């Protein structure tokens, strides 16, 4: 495979491969007199106009240049035998140490699989190395691993009898970043995703959308001064993001990681996809909004090289499964004149009203469920089951979120969300950088083959998939509860209460002898008003729901910009998902055969103490 | 093996008893029909039975369910091993499984039993799942884990009650307490232990006079609360309440249990002003020099390796004196990006003294780490790889007269992989009621010496532990070197003495110095608002948080007679080894000077800034 660019591409005598941070990759003849600079420039550049940094020979072993032999002829003695000729160009855009990664867990990849078990010797030592980078990428490192890695590269230097070890020189010419990251804690080209903090740079222009944009008015700064965020009221709504006119907010890009990730040998990647991402990505690719294109998503994902494509869905049945057994807890205990409980019960996969509470609402803690989003549930289910079943420890998995928002990058980014340093969601990406990869890598989701998503964690009811607009989650909580506590199967599952783009709604849904009062918020003002509200006694509610962006998720900011009407786009959208929820046979979370699947051989129950060991975490500590 | 509260070591129809029972030992048991207990004298203090493990490596596990019904005698397993540990309330379960975890990976690795090989792999998972709950890194999900890899142990096992299991389902409050609140209600989780005041407090308000720094808030009688983000750790509080309302941890029951772990590679250091106040519980004089007991001591309890702080100290002195050079050639050149004074000092309270009230002075101490840090960091990473020991396989533990050197080996910073340079702190009292309990007495004992790699010292470094010394010994050696002239006489009185706030003024050859010296974080105040408000200026500076230096710690035992004479007395003793030895320039050590030769090559290089440095005020 093999292949590497900022605009993403994985492209599958005297010709070289060039895939390093060059426009253009591909393959290239090369003219007999020439430099390093000329081949770049043969190539058209480094993406943006980012400098040469340094250029690797040979995936697996070969030389690593740097500015010093950028003016000299390319002595083609480095292609040593079977180098297989290949060159990996960086620009001062990319992070040496995720690199450095990249190179070790490839040739760490190799040694395992027998074709250089000459380097056996040496596996071990090696795999320290990855694991000092791999701390200092995370930032839980002192300068002491700076030491070790010296003597790890002698180490290899003596066992090798090997002239030239490539971290040697790594350190030796890199010391200045490398103690940037472990000191300051900072990754100068915002690589290292758990290094990077929703930040406004330096190109701002002290415009102001962003300062009116903030619902919770966490923006600072006037005129052309550059505006700041307050880091510790931010709730990661990305409000700020979309209405910049330029690149001055950044949240990372995990995009050439996932590359990597994709281009290790024997590495398995896994993906899950977020409801709302299946209804308008296509919108890219020729489809009207609201079009499922789930398949052809799967079909290209596939292609890129992941091993198995799962579904986030799956993760809101189960989310389902919890919040519903919360929910009719309360009702129950609260019918009987259980003070202790509190009401309403918060059902929201939106990390964004958490601080969104913690910062304004402190006499509400007690209200959102404890249960995990449907993202980290998928996860934790991936890597501490599904992984083991197949025999698979947790780092050998990498699993992939394709969601519709960086707040999703920030709860991924949450360490509750992790164990020995494993993050269950490795890394988050958006539904417009996925756009750009298959753009740049030739998919045309258009014109590719139908692929099935994969069973395990891919089959979905209409209950989950509503949950990417506003009112699916408390519609399937509802559903879910209401048919369990009545006994009755309902002729018509849709409650149209829930449904609508008002910005506060207020429904009344009867059945039986139960009486349940529900408020829905899409737009944390509106929030805001409807949390006045209960504060104050105006109104009572036995359940609310709050999304941060207009629409759901399928409004979020890292979906693809609209064409047309914005509101007209986003509601077609939501309708999408309403026909995906009236095409499906099952339309309540609790007929999902896997998710009780996992009840039955895992967790015994909703709500038992390992439902609760996996499945919920802490709002809040 | 022994173990219980206040420290013991006890190194048919037979049982040994050595859990929390008082007066632990081998015991006749009489065959008569709760009282169990009471024929060994009851539990420590009175708290409630627990539980009681039947045989050490492996056997049963019994809980209150049999306390006060009849105590089966043939229940004990066929296995039993004739020994039992019976805990009390006041035991951690997490610490002791983890001890129970590693006796049995230790016996397995020995090939004592070779039947539960399989097993190994999971069984250690268990262990690092229970350290990551003790070191507070740990979501609800590890207990998910431990039932299943419990459950497989039993399997293989064919074990009619699995440990594990019985553990999670009885004490499953107090696991999810260590997980969701990082509290370990019996406070032997010492990395889950802050410095705290308890509900014991009645609101005397000594504490809030105590404190040099205003941290604590509260009036009337009314519970004290002590501001964190303000904390010294400076120790005032806990000397000065009447009460032992205030709790830090007390780490003997650790470093017990990691004694009493088969093949379990402990090693130990020593502060300088140990050696002349711990003495005093056994009859000596305050400055009496008694390291060589405390050496003996310590290999009777088990101890493996015993080392020297003041070795860690001369190599803090390379470095400080390097740094102290650079800084001078700098400002005599005219380079004002420099900063002085230069501050001097192991003492972690100046920390948070100076970040929350001297934030205009943060480029002013050198970044060298403590003579205990490099000490640890060196043990770890090159002694242990010398001997081909990963840091997890070696137990370093610092014996010291204060709190503050707890929390600082707390710290993160000082730490890789979870792994702490130090992995505990021992407080000399702590020792002297080991060794009182244990039946070990100092000035009974024979002689033994520290061992060499990590224990010679000079002078410089010893007079570390009494106010003025690390000022001292950086002075000696960047003047014998800036001038090329060795000294006639090296001490310095002038850094000597004991008011509060001293001033010095030190010439060697065309070099002239202004030094300040306080001890007592009031007069270090006023010496840095001095500086602050320009009345002074000084090229460096030492400060001490207790009175006398780490001599006056409030780890050290309390005083006997006049309090001043006897701290004098025991910065004398140090004093006066300094004057016994043949060198002393921390310069002059051979140990030192190797660890420069071999891997660091020399001080302020990329090596030694990458290991014995650290960034304060990150
Ligand atoms: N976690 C979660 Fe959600 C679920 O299911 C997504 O994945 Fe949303 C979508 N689509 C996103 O992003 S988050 C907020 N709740 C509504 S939907
Ligand atoms: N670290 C260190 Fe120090 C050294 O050397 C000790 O060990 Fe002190 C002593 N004695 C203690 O406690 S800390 C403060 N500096 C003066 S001396
Ligand atoms: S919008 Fe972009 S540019 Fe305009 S102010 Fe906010 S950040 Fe600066
Ligand atoms: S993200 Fe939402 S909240 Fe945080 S700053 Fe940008 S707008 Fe204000
Ligand atoms: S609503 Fe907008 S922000 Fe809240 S989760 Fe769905 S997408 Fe992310
Ligand atoms: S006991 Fe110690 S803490 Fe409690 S009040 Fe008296 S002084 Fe303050
Ligand atoms: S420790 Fe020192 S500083 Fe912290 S509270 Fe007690 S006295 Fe005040
Ligand atoms: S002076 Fe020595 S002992 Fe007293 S606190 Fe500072 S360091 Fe600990
Ligand atoms: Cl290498
Ligand atoms: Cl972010
Ligand atoms: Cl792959
Ligand atoms: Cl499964
Ligand atoms: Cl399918
Ligand atoms: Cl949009
Ligand atoms: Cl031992
Ligand atoms: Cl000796
Ligand atoms: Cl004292
Ligand atoms: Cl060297
Ligand atoms: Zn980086
Ligand atoms: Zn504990």
Redesign the pocket.
């Known amino acids: 495979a093999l292949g590497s660019v900022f605009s993403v591409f994985s492209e599958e005598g005297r010709k070289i491969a060039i895939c390093g941070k060059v426009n253009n990759p591909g393959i290239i003849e090369v003219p007999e007199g020439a430099t390093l600079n000329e081949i770049i420039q043969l190539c058209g550049g480094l993406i943006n106009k980012s400098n040469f940094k340094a250029a690797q020979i040979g995936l697996p072993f070969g030389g690593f240049l740097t500015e010093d032999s950028l003016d000299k002829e390319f002595d083609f003695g480095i292609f040593y035998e079977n180098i297989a000729r290949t060159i990996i160009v960086l620009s001062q855009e990319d992070c040496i140490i995720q690199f450095e990664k990249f190179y070790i867990e490839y040739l760490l990849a190799k040694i395992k699989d027998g074709s250089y078990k000459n380097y056996e010797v040496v596996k071990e030592d090696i795999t320290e190395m990855f694991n000092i980078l791999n701390r200092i990428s995370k930032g839980v490192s002192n300068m002491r691993e700076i030491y070790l890695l010296r003597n790890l590269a002698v180490t290899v230097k003596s066992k090798m009898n090997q002239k030239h070890n490539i971290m040697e020189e790594i350190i030796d010419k890199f010391y200045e970043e490398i103690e940037e990251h472990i000191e300051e804690k900072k990754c100068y080209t915002s690589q290292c995703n758990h290094l990077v903090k929703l930040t406004i740079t330096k190109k701002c222009i002290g415009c102001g959308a962003c300062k009116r944009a903030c619902p919770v008015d966490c923006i600072n700064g006037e005129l052309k001064k550059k505006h700041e965020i307050d880091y510790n009221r931010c709730t990661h709504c990305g409000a700020c993001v979309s209405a910049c006119p330029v690149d001055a907010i950044s949240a990372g890009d995990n995009t050439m990681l996932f590359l990597r990730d994709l281009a290790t040998p024997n590495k398995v990647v896994i993906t899950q996809?977020?409801?709302?991402?299946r209804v308008a990505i296509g919108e890219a690719f020729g489809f009207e909004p609201g079009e499922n294109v789930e398949k052809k998503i799967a079909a290209g994902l596939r292609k890129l090289g992941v091993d198995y494509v799962f579904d986030?869905?799956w993760?809101?049945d189960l989310?389902i499964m919890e919040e519903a057994a919360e929910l009719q807890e309360r009702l129950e205990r609260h019918l009987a004149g259980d003070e202790s409980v509190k009401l309403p019960i918060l059902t929201?996969?939106?990390?964004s009203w958490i601080k969104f509470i913690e910062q304004n609402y402190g006499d509400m803690l007690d209200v959102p469920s404890s249960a995990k989003?449907?993202?980290?549930?998928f996860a934790i289910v991936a890597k501490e089951i599904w992984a083991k079943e197949k025999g698979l420890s947790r780092d050998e998995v990498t699993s992939v979120?394709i969601?519709?928002?960086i707040?999703?990058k920030y709860?991924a980014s949450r360490a509750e969300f992790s164990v020995d340093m494993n993050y269950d969601v490795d890394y988050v990406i958006t539904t417009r950088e996925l756009i750009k990869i298959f753009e740049n890598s030739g998919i045309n989701l258009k014109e590719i083959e139908d692929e099935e998503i994969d069973t395990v964690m891919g089959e979905y009811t209409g209950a989950?998939i509503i949950?990417?607009?506003t009112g699916?989650?408390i519609e399937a909580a509802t559903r879910t509860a209401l048919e369990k506590m009545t006994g009755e199967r309902f002729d018509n599952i849709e409650f149209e209460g829930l449904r609508g783009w008002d910005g506060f709604r207020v429904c009344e849904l009867e059945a039986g002898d139960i009486k349940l009062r529900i408020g829905v918020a899409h737009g944390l003002r509106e929030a805001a008003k409807m949390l006045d509200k209960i504060r104050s006694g105006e109104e009572f509610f036995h359940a609310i729901e709050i999304?941060?962006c207009v629409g759901?998720?399928?409004g979020?900011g890292?979906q693809p910009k609209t064409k047309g009407n914005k509101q007209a786009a986003l509601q077609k959208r939501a309708e999408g998902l309403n026909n995906i929820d009236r095409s499906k046979t099952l339309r309540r979370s609790n007929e999902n055969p896997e998710v009780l699947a996992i009840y039955e051989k895992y967790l015994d129950h909703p709500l038992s103490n390992k439902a609760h060991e996996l499945l919920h975490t802490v709002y809040f500590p």
């Open positions: 996809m977020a409801p709302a991402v986030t869905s993760g809101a989310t929201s996969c939106c990390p989003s449907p993202m980290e549930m979120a969601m519709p928002c707040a999703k709860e989950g949950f990417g607009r699916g989650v999304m941060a759901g998720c399928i979020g890292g």
